[PDB]
Design a protein around this ligand. Structure first.
Ligand SMILES: CC(C)(CO)[C@@H](O)C(=O)[O-]
Ligand SMILES: CC(C)(CO)[C@@H](O)C(=O)[O-]
Lengths: 287, 287
């Protein structure tokens, strides 16, 4: 028997088999299953992903909420991770989401860490520098979510651009039959990319943090003058802010390969403010 | 949908072609069965084909692809037997409707980028002296399953460790496919069929019967316990001329981090000249 599904309502399932069965049944009923993977602690950024999925005609939106231990560094703090289950589910009901998938670590990893996904070399770069096993954790859980839910489209934020690119590689490399949709970064009024981590910034840090987005947007417009102009402009803005330890500022092509001295690219930055690591990135057109 | 002629063997090289045909078949009610092979087909592969063909409403897809990723060096890859015309002739005689014969470029357009990292079992037995072998097997099988999307996939028990690892792949990545293991097909004297048996000269072919004789002797000696079973097998192998045993191990059936307890699998690998042969058999201890 297929588990119960109440249209127009938020149906919560914790068992992978249950959401797998409902997703299959729904796809056969004329719905297009959209998957929005999350680790909970939902904010406007996540809601933009939800809204992007909702607008596809015939959509039934599946939002997974799972704090994946495999992507937390040996030093990452799994237990400190924010958990607001009831509030999360309330936001999803408010958005008209019909399915929330909330598996336990045990249900997702019943045999512990055994077969896993090994990302390509891009996973050792940029964010992979301080966290070398992070993306293996991300790709492994995303592949599993894709196989459990079998969505027609899966939605990811461009905020975590390197993550997005690596998922696009996973999909191409493993011949996955799903469309990957990247959703533009949602930002606060002054440009700061929305993130659960922003609340950890004290006032001086929060004001200084505007430098990341300001540096990227200045770079985007300075780009008519060339790659070097764009980089120097972004660097000057970061240099005008106190307490912002830049870990990297790199211009690459859109797939994160070497950036041409002309054409489309992506400028990415990461910096530490006190004990908080912030990231941002932006599309760049050179020349 | 590319051309498809029912009751005839349709050969497709393009992944997109077989994927479209498979989906179209799945959509009309036919159940797609996949039999992955590296060609050089013999009666053991035909038993896999026959097992697939008897599933009601089945359409059988046999893939033939000598996967470069699972070979250590170009020498072994170049040495693998290739008998394309005989392979297709045998598939036609078996009533197979689809043969999937991809090129290396179509399967690895980006070289080795995202890949499958098998669990600890891949570093043992066959994997000991070939640490990347099973990562190559699991990566290609994962890709084949995503391309073809079969309801069931068939593997021979002859390469038992491979079969176990594929069951791990399916469980660990939540793949929606049933893995079917088919009993080893043997020559009249017990020799397990293998595309490598062609490299045994008359003397070696005669001596090679020791592997299956050792295993079956062990299976019957087992009523007296594990030591008796192992010693019976060792005695047979030791009496064989020109048989160099690589390993002879008795493990729990999952070959995992579990001690042997009642139901096991006895595995052997031995070299006859430059030809390495494998065989294995079910063992019940004290039964
Ligand atoms: C994609 C994801 C849900 C995987 O755990 C996580 O990395 C996230 O929220 O970006
Ligand atoms: C499973 C397989 C087809 C993957 O290339 C190959 O290892 C084989 O023939 O056993």
């Amino acid at each position: 028997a297929i588990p119960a599904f109440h249209p127009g309502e938020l149906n919560v399932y914790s068992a992978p088999g249950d959401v797998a069965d409902v997703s299959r049944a729904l796809r056969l009923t004329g719905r297009r299953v959209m998957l929005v993977p999350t680790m909970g602690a939902l904010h406007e950024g996540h809601l933009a992903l939800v809204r992007a999925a909702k607008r596809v005609p015939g959509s039934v939106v599946v939002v997974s909420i799972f704090v994946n231990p495999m992507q937390f560094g040996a030093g990452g703090d799994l237990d400190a991770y924010p958990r607001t289950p009831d509030d999360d589910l309330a936001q999803l009901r408010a958005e008209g989401v019909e399915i929330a998938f909330t598996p336990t670590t045990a249900a997702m990893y019943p045999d512990g860490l055994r077969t896993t996904v090994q990302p390509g070399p891009l996973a050792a770069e940029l964010e992979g520098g301080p966290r070398p096993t992070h993306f293996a954790g991300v790709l492994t859980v995303v592949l599993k979510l894709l196989q459990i839910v079998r969505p027609d489209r899966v939605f990811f934020g461009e905020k975590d651009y390197q993550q997005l690119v690596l998922i696009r590689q996973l999909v191409a490399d493993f011949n996955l039959d799903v469309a990957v949709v990247g959703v533009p970064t949602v930002r606060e009024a002054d440009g700061l990319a929305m993130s659960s981590r922003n609340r950890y910034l004290d006032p001086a840090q929060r004001a200084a943090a505007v430098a990341l987005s300001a540096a990227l947007t200045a770079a985007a417009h300075a780009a008519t003058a060339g790659a070097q102009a764009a980089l120097d402009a972004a660097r000057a803005v970061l240099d005008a802010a106190p307490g912002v330890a830049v870990d990297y500022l790199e211009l690459r092509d859109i797939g994160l390969g070497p950036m041409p001295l002309n054409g489309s690219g992506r400028l990415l930055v990461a910096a530490r403010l006190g004990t908080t690591r912030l990231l941002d990135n932006i599309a760049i057109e050179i020349g």
